[PDB]
Copies of this chain bind each other. A is one copy, B any other.
Amino acid sequence: AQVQLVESGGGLVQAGGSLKLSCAASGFTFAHYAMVWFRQAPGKEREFVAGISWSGASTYYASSVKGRFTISRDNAKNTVYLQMNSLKPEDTAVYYVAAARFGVGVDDDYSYWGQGTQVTV
C-alpha cells in the first residue's frame, strides 16, 4: 500500500523567467484516476488552479489564468507536469494535488490528497 503523492519544484525565482514542477504516484492506478491542482494561501483557503481528465484531453483552467500555465501527464512515468510561464508577483502560495476517480476537472469528490510545495516569486 503506502499511497502517497510527493511534490517538488521549490520555485522561489523572481518574476518572468519560468517554473516547472512535477508530481508522482505510489499505490493507485494512474490510468483510472484524475488529478487536479489546488492553491492554498495564508489568507485564502482553496482555488481550482487547473485540471485534466482520465481520458487524456480535457484540459480545464480557471478564469484567473487562461494562457500562462499548461499541464501535461504521462502514464508510463506515473507523473503529471505543470508549467508556469510569465511569473507574476500576485500568485504566491502553496500548491498541492487532489486525486479523484473518473472525473472532468469541475467540482468533484476526492479520496487522496497530496503534499504541499511552497512557491513564492
Please, how many angstroms separate the alpha-carbon atoms of A1 and B58 in the complex?
9
Q: Please determine whether A2 and B115 come into contact, CB atoms closer than 8 angstroms.
A: no
Q: Is the interface of A mostly helix, strand, loop or mixed?
A: loop
Instruction: Give the distance in Å from the alpha carbon of A5 to the alpha carbon of B114 in the complex.
Output: 30
Interface size class of A (residues with CB under 8 A): 10 to 19
Contact A5 B63 (CB under 8 A): yes
Cross-chain contact B114 with A4 (CB below 8 angstroms): no
Number of copies: 3
Interface contact B63-A6, CB-CB below 8 Å? yes
Kindly identify, within residues 1 to 55 of chain A, every residue whose CB is under 8 Å from any CB belonging to chain B.
1-2, 4-6
- Tell me if A77 is interfacial: C-beta within 8 Å of chain B: no
Contact, CB under 8 Å: B4 / A66: yes
User: Bound complex: CA of A62 vs CA of B60, how far in Å?
Assistant: 29
0 or 1 for each of A72-114: is its CB under 8 Å from B? (1 = yes): 0000000000000000000000000000000000000000001
Q: Which residues of B contact A114 (CB under 8 A)?
A: 63
Sample (11) of A-B pairs whose CB atoms are under 8 Å apart: A1-B60, A2-B61, A2-B66, A4-B62, A4-B63, A4-B66, A5-B63, A6-B63, A63-B114, A63-B115, A64-B115
